[PDB]
Amino acid sequence: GWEIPEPYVWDESFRVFYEQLDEEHKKIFKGIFDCIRDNSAPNLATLVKVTTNHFTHEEAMMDAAKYSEVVPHKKMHKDFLEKIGGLSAPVDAKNVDYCKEWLVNHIKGTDFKYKGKL
């Protein structure tokens, strides 16, 4: 239900207040923006790589903090990796939209729950 930025770029409304997570989030927005601009195999692979790194990092912080809601969270991450992991360039228009919307809703609806808890 959250608004999708146009152009697709991270903004302060998305801040989680963990400098490393915020930088990772900015790179995932950029990853998707680059696939929008140039729907190539290298850009899709980059998106897969930065998202994988991000999930590993965010889950390691959630674990360390004995954050209570890490199981539903990790399930959402695993599902998204499964999905983008399976795409091939050029990504079709319906899946680019799916990715644009997915990130926006994942950050504001789920990552936002860990603000101040890590």
Please give the annotated binding residues, written as ranges.
25, 54, 58, 73, 77, 106, 111
Resolution of this deposited model, Å: 1.3
Q: Does CATH place domain 1-118 in 3.30.565.10?
A: no
SS3 category, 28: helix
Structure tokens that stand for 93 in this block: 């228009």
Please give the annotated binding residues for Fe cation, written as ranges.
25, 54, 58, 73, 77, 106, 111
Domain regions of the chain by residue span: 1-118
Distance CA 86, CA 90 (A): 12
Query: What is the widest separation between alpha-carbon atoms in the chain?
Result: 40
**Of 7, 36, 6, 8, nearest in space to 103 by CA:** 8
Distance CA 86, CA 73 (A): 21
**Of 2, 6, 16, 11, nearest in space to 118 by CA:** 16
Amino acid found at 50: V
Experimental approach taken: X-ray
**Of 43, 19, 17, nearest in space to 31 by CA:** 43
45-70: burial string, b at 16+ Cβ within 10 Å, e else = ebbbebbeebbeebbebbeeeebeeb
